[PDB]
Every structure is written in C-alpha cells, then in structure tokens.
Amino acid sequence: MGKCRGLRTARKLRSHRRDQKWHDKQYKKAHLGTALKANPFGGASHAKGIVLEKVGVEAKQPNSAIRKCVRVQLIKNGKKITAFVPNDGCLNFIEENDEVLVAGFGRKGHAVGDIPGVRFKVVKVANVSLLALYKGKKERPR
Amino acid sequence: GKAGDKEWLPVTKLGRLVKDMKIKSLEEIYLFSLPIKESEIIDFFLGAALKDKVLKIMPVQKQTQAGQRTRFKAFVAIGDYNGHVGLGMKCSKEVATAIRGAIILAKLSIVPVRRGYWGNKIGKPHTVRCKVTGRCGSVLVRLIPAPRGTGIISAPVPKKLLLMAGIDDCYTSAGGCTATLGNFAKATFDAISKTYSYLTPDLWKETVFTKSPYQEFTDHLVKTHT
Amino acid sequence: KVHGSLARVGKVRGQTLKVAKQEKKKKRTGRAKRRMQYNRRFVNVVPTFGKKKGPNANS
Amino acid sequence: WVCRKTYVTPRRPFEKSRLDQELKLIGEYGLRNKREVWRVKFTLAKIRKAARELLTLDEKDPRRLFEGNALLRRLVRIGVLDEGKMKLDYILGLKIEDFLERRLQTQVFKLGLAKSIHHARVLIRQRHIRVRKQVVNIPSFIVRLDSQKHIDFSLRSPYGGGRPGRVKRKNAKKGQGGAGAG
Amino acid sequence: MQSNAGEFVDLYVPRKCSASNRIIGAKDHASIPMNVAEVDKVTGRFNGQSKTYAICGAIRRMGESDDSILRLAKSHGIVSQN
RNA sequence: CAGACACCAUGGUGCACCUGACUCCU
RNA sequence: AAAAAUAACAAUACAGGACUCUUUCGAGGCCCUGUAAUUGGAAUGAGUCCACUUUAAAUCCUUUAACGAGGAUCCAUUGGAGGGCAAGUCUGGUCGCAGCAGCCGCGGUAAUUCCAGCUCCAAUAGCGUAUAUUAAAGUUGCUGCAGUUAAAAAGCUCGUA
C-alpha cells in the first residue's frame, strides 16, 4: 500500500491508478496497437491468405518430432507469417499458393509447444476446411 | 472373512467419566475446554456420520546420503454435518498408513464450529453469524455468510469443509498462492474454529464458570487412581 | 532453426486402420437417449453390487 | 425485436458430481436434455435473489409489497409456492423440483394415461391431452392450480374419445387389413 | 449464543473470564477454572463448596492470573487479612 | 598464547508418480 | 433467441432390491429396466395433404378429411478420456517417428497422451474453433495490492504546488 488519502484526492487517484495501470504488460501493448501492428490478428478473428511455402520444421528440443508448418502471406493483413499445420497426414493437402484461412493458435501473441516463433494455425487449407479434410468430411478440390 | 474389534481404555480422568456415563458428550468437554488424548472418547459419543475425507496424500521427500527419502503426507479430515469437523495429517512411508494414521488424528482433532444465521433469527443454523477468515502461508481464506438457497460458493476444497460444518450458505474470496492446497485447507480450518471466537452480543451473557469435573467426580474417579 | 524439409506425412496413419460398428439397437437421440442414461445406470437391477469402476474402466 | 435466453450456463465446465446430478432430474422428471435442467436453473437463481432483495428491503415498501405480493401470488397461482407460509424466508428455501412437479409432464404421470415419465412427455408431445379447450403440446408448461382440473383426453386423440386422425384407424387397420388380409 | 426468543442455535455455551472479559472456547489449553474452598468463619473446618473462577491461557501466557485471582479472591472474599 | 605458509585448467545425460472396505467364510 | 422431436408403452424373459415362504439356500415377489424374440393394441407430426384460414395478394402459422414407426425406425450431433478436465492403468498399430500437447505433457517398443478401432464421457440441433472483450484477478488492488530479503522508499534534506 502507501498512499495519500483525503477529500480532494479524486483528482489524484484518477491520475494515480491509470498511470500505474500503464505499467501492466497486458494494458500497454494492447493499447499501443502493437498487437495489431506486429501481429496480423488482433484486428481479425479469421484472416484468409496465400500460402507462401510449406515449411517442414524439425522441432527445437524438447519434444523430438518434425512440426511441418506452413508459411502464409495474408490478404487483409499482407503479413508473411508462418502457421503451424496440425492434422497428421494433412500437410499433404497443402501446396504452395494454396490460399488458406489462418488463425492464431492458442497463445494469441507468442510461441506454442516445442517450436519458437510459430503462433498461428490454419483453419481451412485451400479455404476448404482442413478439419473436414482430416475428418474426411471434405476432399480438396484443387 | 476378517473383522475388527474395539477395546476401551481410559488414560485420563475423562475417559473413565466417559466410559462410566458421567461425561456423555464432547459438548461438555467443548464447554470444559479440556484436552482429549483418546479418539475413542469421540467414538464413544458419536461414532456416526463423521465423514472421513482423504484430501491429499502428497509425496514429499528429503534428500539423504544415499539418494533420497520420501514419505506420503496424507491429509485426512473428519466431520459430521452438524457443527463438528476435524483434520489429521500423517506423514508416513505408506499411503494407507498415512491415511489410517491421519484418520485417527482427524478423530482426535474434531472441533466444534459455531453455525448461525445470515440475516435470519430462526431456522436451525444454516451459515455463520459473522464473516470469518484465516491464513496459512499468505493464503487468506475469508468466509462470508449467505442466506438460504444460495449455496456454498467456494473453491472445491473449502466447499467440502463448509459442507462438513453444515454451513450451507457461504461466500468466498481468497488471495495468496494458487497451488498449495494443503495451505488452503489449513487456512480454511483457521476460519471455522474462529466461529466460536467471535464474541456475539448473544455471547455477552456470561456463564457460571463450571467446577472441573475432575474434582466434581474425584471420588467416583477412584478406580485405581482418582 | 532454419530447416524446412518435410519427411513423412501420415506415416502412422498409413499403418493404423479403421472399421465401423453397426447399431444392433440404434443410437437413440436427444429425448429418449438422455432419459436412458439415468435409468440404465441405476435401475435395472437397482445397484446393490460392486465398487471401484468407471463406465469404461479396465481399472 | 427483443429476445433472451431461457437457459443458463455455470462457470464450471466439468463438475461430474453436478453433471450426474443433472442426469437425475432428467431421469426423475422426464426431461429432454440438460437444457431442461438449465431452464429452471436459469429461473430459480433469479427467484431466490428476488426473494433475497425484497427481504433486504425495508418493510411497508410498495415495491417490496405490491411487487412482492404479486410475486407471492404469482408463485401461488401456479401452485408451486403455497401462501400458507408466504414470506421471503421460505422463498429462499424453494427448489427446482417444485416447478417440475407443476409441469404438465409429471401431472400427466401423476394423473392420467401415463405409465412412465418417458410416456408422460409423449402424451403431451403426441397431443393426446387437452388441458383446457386446448391441445397443449408443451411439456414444460408449468401449470396452475385450476390447470390440474381439466387435463383430459384430447379430441384429436381418437382413443379415449376423439375424432380419428390416421392412427386408431391404423390400429383399426391392424384389425382391418392387419387382420382383414388386405 | 442463542437465536429467536427461546430457541438456541449454538452447540454449547463456551466459558468466559472475569480478568479480560474474554471467552474460554472449545479445547483451549491452560484454560481452567480455579476452585477455591469456602473455609468458614471462625468455627472452622472448611465449608464444602469451592469458589470457582475461570482462567484462560491468554491471561496465563501474559502472566496476569496471579493478580487476576487476587482481583477475584481478595476482592470477592473470603480471605483472611483482607 | 610467543619460529619459517609456491601454482594447480576443463568436463556431460531418462525412470521420486494422485484414494477406502475385512463375506480366507474360519 | 424461444418452444423441444426423431417414438413410447407394457407383455415376455432374465438380472436381481425389498418382500413372503424358507434354517438359509432357493422359491414366490413386484419396482422393473437393460437386453431377448418380439410385438400387442396405443400413438404422433418429422411429413404429405383436400379443405377453412392467412394477408396488399399472399406466405407461413394454426385448423385439418386423409394417409406417414416394432425396426439396424421416421436411424443427432459436436467435443474429450495422460493430467488439469468428466470419461479407455481399453484394442491394434506406431516407436521421440508419425503425430499429439491452451498449459502441465506423451511417442526413444510391451503408448492410458500418437494414430485409429472399440468403449466411455460431455453437452446437444447444436457442439467445437478463431479472435475480441468481462470476470475469475486483491496479477492495477476506489472498496482492497506489494515496496528489509520475491517486482517496488528517490543519495540526503529543505521546500512550493
């Protein structure tokens, strides 16, 4: 604790609370617009984008496996981002220039799992629902 | 086919007055504020509804000269749903030894909790009369009474503890460390024995300062020793 | 690090295969399904027997 | 223009003791899913707090009385509450199942052509009953006191009295084509 | 601690003290009565009933109980030379 | 209490795992 | 967003729980509920459909003559079982691979984390995801934060606002 308290200090605590609230990491970057600026989401819920390339990522230790991500430039955002590929046997559904609906994965701003720098996933590979592709409910028409 | 037995033994003046139907309830000793070293005194008096709750058997350990050494830190609580709850902690090498040890330690350590009313004045108590609290390593467990139909709005560890009291209507707000659950229940056990500790104006009517049934029965207490 | 070469996609899926199991009695739906879930779990015989299980436990 | 949800969602996702407790009320009263549990669960939290707020109001307040005596009467016209107690302390003591008994379904199971509460929901859903001059098709109907005095066969149930639709005819066709050999 | 007029909510009535005006609770240790025999009135051969005075551990752990019963046995009687 | 005192670098990896009941029927 | 279907219901039988007989056994004995072969009358729109209706005209709605369920039906889904987190110490495969895993984590061969089967759980005409924000959060603490050693008393003092 430790504060002034009187009958005119509404002027103080109006200044004092928010200026201490600016020290919050969650309050700062969300109100700097940097999450919109550094990340393509923050200003989108889903965003469609062209596959730049398919990136078969060997995982940095721990969790020894191969991640096999994909790299996407969005259309509304234009940001050359790398999205993780879930769904075993469905990196095969991806090509290059294979326009995908990307989403943030689970962290909304930082890396997940055993793999640094990747914070995105693809909802719809070829915009034809990779979930239904892994379920077999859809086939890739491309 | 296997069965258990019970044999009474008094080790104090109380347990003779227990076994001879001179002390009939813990409520006397709860008024008398006397020690109890026999969990069977409790078992002589209630023997029923005293729900045993094995909370956490957590494996704690110490490092030794040859590797390490571990033990099971079992948290067994007792209580009937009537205003009396207990707790035992037994740190044994086995699980069930640490369980059945802390079972009897819960039996010996059953304490009364004082239930009351929220804003009610009648209705056979449903909550506390007063907001009570307790800490165990910076984990503050504050309890706030509720009226009837509200329920025990709690973390799942005090929700069972407020259940065993019979405090069926309570609010919670806890601050501190988020993971140390044994310090949650031990801080929660501080608040429930605090229910008698708050001085109600109903408790301003003082008592007649009863006269030590050691001395009141010391001639009846002559069995092999007074 | 920098590496971007895929090696195996569906390596375990090409060697792990599936079948189906047909309804002898149907998958009952909605109303009489959720009605069935209470009465089957308790009153068939009324539970007098048993301990230490889940509904799928080999435990 | 204006709509709302009539069910509720708790803040705990998996509380299996509660999840099987909700399985009881479906099996004890004949419900569709946990939404029919959560529908009355949506109401009864507001009912106790409305009982709580009027209790914490100062007495002889018309917003405590005229609203409350309506709320006393509204809970008694449906026969869930009885007004022999008729104060806010006991309204804090009501429950879900007092309404479930005053549903149309259980009163059909209590009174009439229902052998089961599977069966009791069916007789409303397959419109065998008239609760008034009213084919009533809603099992969550929660009834009033007079409502339990006119539940009959419907006149669209051709058994127990009614104009034939196609079913007692089919059950006649079970003896006139099921037994008439064509 | 009681409820509505004739109805008693509490499980029991915990004891008190006269030195700190403070209750003696449930299982409180060094929380004891003090039974001091009524000795009688030059005829002698002490008369039965001991004068009781409940002492808590708090006034004991603060070391108050010596003057406290001196405020209870001298002040209330009976004691010679007082 | 109260006699004499030099430099000596490096080095590495998996398993401590979360509940109760006693119809051996003698 | 609201109502809430995709069938009950018995009979049968078992599998028993009281029960009654029986020293118990066991039998009788229902509540039955699953499961059996079934159904038996008994239904119902989900439909289809004359018709009345409807309204600017309609349209739907409701009204319906009439048809539309014994079965694998007129046949629900979407999520989860390594924990957190409910429900696979399943069955198979895989063998630090493929994948999975918000987090804590599996997989380096007798995989409860994979991948499936199966079983179960969960909600349910929804369920799941993404992102967003509100709480939980007394981790912004006005109520109500912490500042010796975890973040946090200015080098010290006067001294105005």
Swiss-Prot record, chain A:
KW Zinc (keyword) present: no
Positions bearing 3-hydroxyproline: 62
Comp. bias (Basic residues): 1-20
UniProt region (Disordered), positions on chain: 1-26
Molecular functions per Gene Ontology: RNA binding; structural constituent of ribosome
Modified residues (N6-succinyllysine): 54
Subcellular localization: Cytoplasm, Cytosol; Cytoplasm; Rough endoplasmic reticulum; Nucleus, Nucleolus
PROSITE patterns cross-referenced by the UniProt entry: RIBOSOMAL_S12
List of residues that carry N6-acetyllysine: 135
Pfam families the UniProt entry points to: Ribosom_S12_S23
Keywords of the record: Acetylation, Cytoplasm, Deafness, Disease variant, Dwarfism, Endoplasmic reticulum, Hydroxylation, Isopeptide bond, Nucleus, Ribonucleoprotein, Ribosomal protein, Ubl conjugation
InterPro entries named in the record: NA-bd_OB-fold, Ribosomal_uS12, Ribosomal_uS12_euk/arc
GO cellular component terms given for this protein: cytoplasm; cytosol; cytosolic ribosome; cytosolic small ribosomal subunit; endoplasmic reticulum; membrane; nucleolus; nucleoplasm
GO process annotations (BP): cytoplasmic translation; maintenance of translational fidelity; ribosomal small subunit biogenesis; stress granule assembly; translation
UniProt modification remark: Hydroxylation at Pro-62 affects translation termination efficiency.
Covalent crosslink: Glycyl lysine isopeptide (Lys-Gly) (interchain with G-Cter in SUMO2): 37
Keyword Glycoprotein: no
Cited function: Component of the ribosome, a large ribonucleoprotein complex responsible for the synthesis of proteins in the cell. The small ribosomal subunit (SSU) binds messenger RNAs (mRNAs) and translates the encoded message by selecting cognate aminoacyl-transfer RNA (tRNA) molecules. The large subunit (LSU) contains the ribosomal catalytic site termed the peptidyl transferase center (PTC), which catalyzes the formation of peptide bonds, thereby polymerizing the amino acids delivered by tRNAs into a polypeptide chain.
Subunit relationships: Component of the 40S small ribosomal subunit. Part of the small subunit (SSU) processome, composed of more than 70 proteins and the RNA chaperone small nucleolar RNA (snoRNA) U3.
Family: Belongs to the universal ribosomal protein uS12 family.
Protein name, UniProt field: Small ribosomal subunit protein uS12
From Swiss-Prot, chain C:
Listed transmembrane segments: none
Region (Disordered): 10-36
Compartments reported by the entry: Cytoplasm; Nucleus
Subunit structure: Component of the 40S subunit of the ribosome.
Name recorded for this polypeptide: Small ribosomal subunit protein eS30
In-chain residues carrying the UniProt-annotated modification N6-succinyllysine: 51
Cited function: Component of the 40S subunit of the ribosome. Contributes to the assembly and function of 40S ribosomal subunits.
Ranges of compositional bias, category Basic residues: 23-36
UniProtKB/Swiss-Prot annotation, chain D:
Result for mutant: residue 131 to F: In a breast cancer sample; somatic mutation
Main location: cytoplasm
SMART domains linked to this entry: Ribosomal_S4, S4
An annotated Gene Ontology molecular function: structural constituent of ribosome
Disulfide bonds: none
A Pfam family assignment: Ribosomal_S4
Entry-linked InterPro entries: Ribosomal_uS4, Ribosomal_uS4_CS, Ribosomal_uS4_euk/arc, Ribosomal_uS4_N, S4_RNA-bd, S4_RNA-bd_sf
UniProt KW keywords: Acetylation, Cytoplasm, Isopeptide bond, Nucleus, Phosphoprotein, Ribonucleoprotein, Ribosomal protein, RNA-binding, rRNA-binding, Ubl conjugation
Region (Disordered): 156-182
Subcellular compartments: Cytoplasm; Nucleus, Nucleolus
Domain S4 RNA-binding: 102-176
A Gene Ontology term for the protein's cellular component: cytoplasm
Modified residues (N6-acetyllysine): 60, 110, 149
Top-level taxon of origin: Eukaryota
Biological-process GO terms, alphabetical: cytoplasmic translation; positive regulation of cell population proliferation; ribosomal small subunit biogenesis; translation
PTM sites of type Phosphoserine: 147, 157
Glycyl lysine isopeptide (Lys-Gly) (interchain with G-Cter in SUMO2) crosslink location in chain: 87, 133
Subunit structure: Component of the small ribosomal subunit. Identified in a IGF2BP1-dependent mRNP granule complex containing untranslated mRNAs. Part of the small subunit (SSU) processome, composed of more than 70 proteins and the RNA chaperone small nucleolar RNA (snoRNA) U3.
Family assignment from sequence similarity: Belongs to the universal ribosomal protein uS4 family.
Role noted for this protein: Component of the small ribosomal subunit. The ribosome is a large ribonucleoprotein complex responsible for the synthesis of proteins in the cell. Part of the small subunit (SSU) processome, first precursor of the small eukaryotic ribosomal subunit. During the assembly of the SSU processome in the nucleolus, many ribosome biogenesis factors, an RNA chaperone and ribosomal proteins associate with the nascent pre-rRNA and work in concert to generate RNA folding, modifications, rearrangements and cleavage as well as targeted degradation of pre-ribosomal RNA by the RNA exosome.
Name of the protein this chain belongs to: Small ribosomal subunit protein uS4
Organism whose genome encodes this protein: Homo sapiens (Human)
Gene behind this protein: RPS9
